[PDB]
Amino acid sequence: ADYVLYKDATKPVEDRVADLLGRMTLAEKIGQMTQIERLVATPDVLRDNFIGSLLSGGGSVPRKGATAKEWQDMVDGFQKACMSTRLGIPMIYGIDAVHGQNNVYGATIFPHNVGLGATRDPYLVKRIGEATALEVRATGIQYAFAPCIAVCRDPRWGRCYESYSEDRRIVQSMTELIPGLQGDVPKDFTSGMPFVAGKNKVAACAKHFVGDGGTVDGINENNTIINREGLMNIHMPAYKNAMDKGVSTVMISYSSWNGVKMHANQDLVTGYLKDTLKFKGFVISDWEGIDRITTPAGSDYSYSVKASILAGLDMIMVPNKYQQFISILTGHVNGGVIPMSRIDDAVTRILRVKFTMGLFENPYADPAMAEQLGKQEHRDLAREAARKSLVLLKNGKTSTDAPLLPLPKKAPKILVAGSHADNLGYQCGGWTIEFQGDTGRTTVGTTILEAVKAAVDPSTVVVFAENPDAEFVKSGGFSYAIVAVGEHPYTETKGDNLNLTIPEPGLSTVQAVCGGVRCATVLISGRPVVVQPLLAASDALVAAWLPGSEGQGVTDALFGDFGFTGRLPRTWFKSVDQLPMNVGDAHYDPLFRLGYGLTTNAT
Ligand SMILES: CO[C@@H]1O[C@H](CS[C@@H]2O[C@H](CO)[C@@H](O)[C@H](O)[C@H]2O)[C@@H](O)[C@H](O)[C@H]1O
């Protein structure tokens, strides 16, 4: 009697979309296109403005240390308000689960993407997507702003660690994250259609469209200076692979392509992504990305709304001034500046994703999934990934020396040292707990020092000293040392760095240690950094990138349980004066070329 077709789970998605769209008011439509921060959301706001989506931006959590159930109860509280609207359209909640569900205390933290590139193991990355989707659903969240498919062309960019590689082919291969997060697409699948398998999967997001990895001087907020040919040949291809794998959403770059702001680029967003690649999911802005269309940012927000929505963006990550956004867009539609056809297209795409993914059938969190958070199988996977990511750059000072690695687990006394040997937050890097990461024991994990203590024979005495002097080392009766140093956590706008040298004490500790005893240096970094001096001092040196919460991945290789297999996914420069300098360039003079990596055999 009271049958409503969009509420019928047995109906085809396109019929449900069209049935719902035909019923919606303009307020209901513009609400769907609006994404807000949890920080500004209340039940009344969500209901009264018919809100379509929420997010947690970096560090946006219900409280420090919050359990999986606390996150579920948060998300469900917001959902209950959404489901209480006239039409009962469930919100989608988005988060940056970019190396695990990394805002959440106790989530497994996987290596960052640059290290995943070093594994050259797309099936490993798919399995990471799988595990990540489980840990995201453990917290009640249904959408991950991942993968970042940037092709970072200059390691001075502060997000270079979010790129699998400077080589688009490796980036393309690691789009296997998508069917991990979302599920494998049907055999009959049409490229560009969105797909999510159901309540144990999440919607994914290929980001940031397009050429975010190309930006002049590394910088971003900035211009990506190259022609159609290098756009199409370097920066774009992985977006086609993402279409073929049913990526549900695409996020637009803050960047510009040849002086045109991506958030205002109709030719690329509508002409290419939608009309040429036949993308049928939704296009989301970046954080205040429409604001940044103008200079200064936010100085003509009316223009920002007109320009972005006419360019083809579907959902706007406001994320705070939702009343201004909705008011302005409403005015634009009432005035005929934005046609109803454009609103209807945006809403069609958002609804298409929501229906496809089963969000109308399972709008609420599954309490039984809470135990997927930080689950030990997932940590075992992260430990495998971390080990596979390690690139061995040196293993002996001369070709006649005994190879230092693998180290024996049985020795009378060994030294573990360095700023990075017992600091979980430094080993995770940015996008861990906080936006910019943090120092010290910020989540559940195993530092390098703890990993060493867990690996060695019970007779081996392990001494830790963060920054020992040369005399301490020479007097200590050590068999060897493991010294871990490197970069502090960062994101784009502390991490855009011109000198790329590691902070002190880092080199000075390696010199003091290695001057006294043979030493294996573990370099923790988001990118290649100035390395000759560290190499000169070290018997062995490993580029461990940002390996995440499972430090036993490092020791699994140091102690020979597995052989080193990682290969550089980026060029290692001799000097920052050379940059940009990528594989295949004409003037190509690397310290280590892309693909370089020494090996060991398991003992
Ligand atoms: C600096 O202010 C903080 O910015 C971060 C990153 S900006 C933008 O954020 C999106 C949603 O988190 C990410 O998917 C995207 O990759 C980033 O470019 C933001 O997360 C914080 O919320 C904001 O305080």
TrEMBL record:
Pfam families: Glyco_hydro_3, Glyco_hydro_3_C. Glycans are attached at N222, N499, N601. Keywords: Glycosidase, Hydrolase, Signal. The keyword Zinc does not apply. Residues 25-353 form the Glycoside hydrolase family 3 N-terminal domain. GO terms for biological process: carbohydrate metabolic process. The keyword GTP-binding does not apply. Disulfide bonds join C152-C160, C514-C519. One of its GO terms (molecular function) is hydrolase activity, hydrolyzing O-glycosyl compounds. InterPro entries: Cellulose_Degrad_GH3, GH, Glyco_hydro_3_C, Glyco_hydro_3_C_sf, Glyco_hydro_3_N, Glyco_hydro_3_N_sf. Gene3D superfamilies: Glycoside hydrolase family 3 C-terminal domain, Glycoside hydrolase, family 3, N-terminal domain. Residues 390-599 form the Glycoside hydrolase family 3 C-terminal domain. Coiled coil: none annotated. This is Beta-D-glucan exohydrolase isoenzyme ExoI. It comes from Hordeum vulgare subsp. vulgare.
